Design a protein around this ligand. Structure first.
Ligand SMILES: [Mg+2]
Length: 227
């Protein structure tokens, strides 16, 4: 299955365990490199890594350059290697004045329009310590909660929904919706494997899209697999 359906396995592995790359209050090293910013000496794996954070525009990299930021991101292997250098997309928010005590984001989970249990009193409850937070951070936290409690990507402990889909789960269709106060709806297909590789699935996050953490709710619409 890994040889001939790698996208399913890569997507599964992206969100099934919770180990985001996080830095608090750091400044990038040297000037920006077009759309990218470098952060040195981040604890990782067997030692440390230099993290190259890419955004979708020179304007964005320039904006954050020389400012303290928090990073919350999913990294990938770049573009050769080594093991002490990793790449990522977006995940950056200004540090100064952005800290708050954990704020839970309102979350609704549906299966074919039928609301499901969701706990606000857990460690993995979707929350953030940031006034302005990236959609990437909320997506990572939400999909981890989903895998933990609904086994959407397969091979988890929850057997309630079966295992018949192409993800060896109850599901192979559904969107996560970030409803901003503005009326803007950001919608991602939760079962999109992109071009099969990890990087292709992370590129969406290059927009570094943010929301205020008390100015959105998250709706998760799963479609139960029949067949
Ligand atoms: Mg809604």
């Amino acid at each position: 299955y890994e040889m001939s359906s790698v996208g399913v396995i890569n997507l599964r592995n992206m969100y099934s365990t919770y180990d985001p790359t996080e830095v608090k209050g750091k400044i990038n090293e040297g000037p920006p490199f077009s759309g990218s910013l470098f952060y040195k000496n981040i604890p990782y794996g067997n030692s440390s890594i230099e993290l190259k954070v890419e955004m979708n525009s020179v304007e964005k990299a320039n904006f954050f350059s020389g400012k303290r930021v928090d990073i919350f991101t999913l990294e990938y292997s770049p573009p050769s290697n080594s093991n002490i250098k990793k790449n990522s997309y977006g995940g950056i928010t200004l540090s100064d004045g952005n800290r708050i005590d954990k704020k839970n984001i309102p979350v609704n989970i549906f299966i074919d329009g039928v609301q499901q249990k969701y706990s606000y009193t857990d460690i993995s409850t979707v929350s953030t310590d940031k006034k302005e937070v990236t959609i990437q951070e909320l997506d990572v936290k939400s999909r981890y909660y989903l895998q933990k409690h609904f086994n959407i990507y397969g091979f988890g402990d929850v057997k309630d929904f079966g295992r018949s889909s192409r993800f060896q789960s109850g599901f192979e269709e559904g969107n996560i919706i970030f409803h901003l106060n503005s009326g803007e709806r950001i919608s991602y297909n939760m079962f999109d494997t992109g071009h099969g590789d990890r990087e292709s699935m992370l590129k969406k996050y290059s927009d570094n899209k943010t929301a205020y953490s008390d100015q959105l709710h998250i709706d998760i619409y799963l479609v139960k697999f029949n067949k």
